[PDB]
Design a protein around this ligand. Sequence first.
Ligand SMILES: COc1ccc2cccc(CCNC(C)=O)c2c1
Length: 485
Amino acid sequence: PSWLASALACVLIFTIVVDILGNLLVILSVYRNKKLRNAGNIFVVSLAVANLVVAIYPYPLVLMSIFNNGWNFGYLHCQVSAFLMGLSVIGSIWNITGIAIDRYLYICHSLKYDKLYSSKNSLCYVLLIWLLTLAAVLPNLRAGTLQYDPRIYSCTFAQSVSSAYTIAVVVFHFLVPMIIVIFCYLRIWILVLQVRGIDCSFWNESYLTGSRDERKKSLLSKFGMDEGVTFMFIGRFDRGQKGVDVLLKAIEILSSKKEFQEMRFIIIGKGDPELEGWARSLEEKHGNVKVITEMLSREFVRELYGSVDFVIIPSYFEPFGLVALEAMCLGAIPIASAVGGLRDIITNETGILVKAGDPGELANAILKALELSRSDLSKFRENCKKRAMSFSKLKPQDFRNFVTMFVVFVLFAICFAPLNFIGLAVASDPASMVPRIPEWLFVASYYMAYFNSCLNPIIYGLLDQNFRKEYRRIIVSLCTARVFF
Ligand SMILES: COc1ccc2cccc(CCNC(C)=O)c2c1
C-alpha cells in the first residue's frame, strides 16, 4: 500500500485544483452570462460555494496528513476541519434538493401560466438551507463524534462513536433528500413525456364537421340507440391493469337505478374472454350498452372522442395516460382514477376524479356526471381543451438543463451511496463492524465523496452549452491582453 498512499494524494491534488478553479468559474459564469443570470440558478451558486469551502481549509490539511501519516495539527484544527466538511456535505445534498423542487415547480408553473416562473424567494430558501445544515452539523462538536481516522488520514464524523447520530444522519440527511429528489425528477420526466406524446395536429376538433349534438346523435343512431348522456371506454380487457372489471361491476349497480334509462355506454377493447363475455352479457340484457371487441381506427377513435360526453379511464395503474389527454383535445370530459400521471393531467376544474378499484364510487361519479346540464358541460369542455393546449405549448422548449441538474444529482448519489451504506453497517454493532468492513471499501467510500466536490463544474461544461460558452469566454479574456496599433 506504499503507492496507494501517493495515489490517494493525487486524487485530492486533482480535486483541490479542479474545485478552486472550476467552482470559481461557475460563480463568474452565472454573473457574466444573461442567459444563466436567472433567479432559479441562485441554488447553483450556493452549491458551488459549498464545494469551494472544503478545498480552501479541510482538504489541504488532509493532503499533508497523508504524507505526515498522522495528525500533526491541534484538536481545534481537527474539530473545525471536520465541522466545515459537514456544512459542505450536508449543504450540498440540501442545495441539490432545492434545485429538484425549483425545476419541478418550473414545469408546473409554465403549464398553468403564460408567464415564466420567477423564483422570487430563491435567496430566502438558500439562507433557510444554511440555517438547517448548521443546525445538524453544530451538535457534533458537543457530542464529540468528530475525530481523526488514520486509514483515511482525515478528521471526519466517526460513525462508530454514536450509532443513534449516524442512523439520523443517514435517514434525515441522505434517505430523506434522496426520496424527495427521486420523486421530483420522476414527475418531471412524466410531464416531459406527456408533452412529447401529444399531437395537436391529429387530435384536433377541426377534423370534425357538424355540431357535437349532431355528431353524437349520428354516432348513437349507427349503434342502434337514441339520444342520452354517452359514456365511453377504450382499452384492453384485464382483471387488474386498465380496470374494465370495475366499470362492468359499476354498470350492474347503475342498471337498477331509474337514472340508467338516460345513460348510453360504448365499451371498446379486447382481452380476458370471461370479461369479454360479461360485457356481451350486459349488451344483451340492456339496449343502452354497446360492446366493440374489434380494433377501431385512430381516425374513428378521434371521431368518438369528439362525439361522446364522457370518457371513463378506470385504470388501476396508469403512469402516463395520454388517452385521458387525447380525449380532452376533442372536448371529452374524463372520469378517471386518481393515479400518478392521471392526477397531473386531470385538474379538479377539467374532469371528475375517483378512487381506483371502487365500482361504488365510480357509479356515483357517473351519476354526478349525469347530474350536469348542457350549460355546465360547455365550460368543462373548454377547460379540457385549454388544458390539452397548454401541454403542446411546451414542445419547442430546450429541456437540456433538466438533464444536467439530474446528472449533477445522479453523480452525487453514486459518490455518497457507499459512505451512507457503511454508516448503517457500522451503526448495527460499532465494536464488531470496525474490522468486519474491508479497508479498501472504507477508503474508497470516503475518497469518492471527496472527489464529488470537483465533479459539478466538469458536468456543467460537458452538458450545458451556455456554461461551456462562458468557460471559454472568461479563459480567453484573462489570457489575451489589450494593445493599441
Ligand atoms: C453528520 O454530520 C457530519 C459532520 C461532519 C462530517 C464531516 C465529513 C463527512 C460527514 C459525513 C459522514 N456521515 C455519514 C452519515 O456517513 C460529516 C457529517
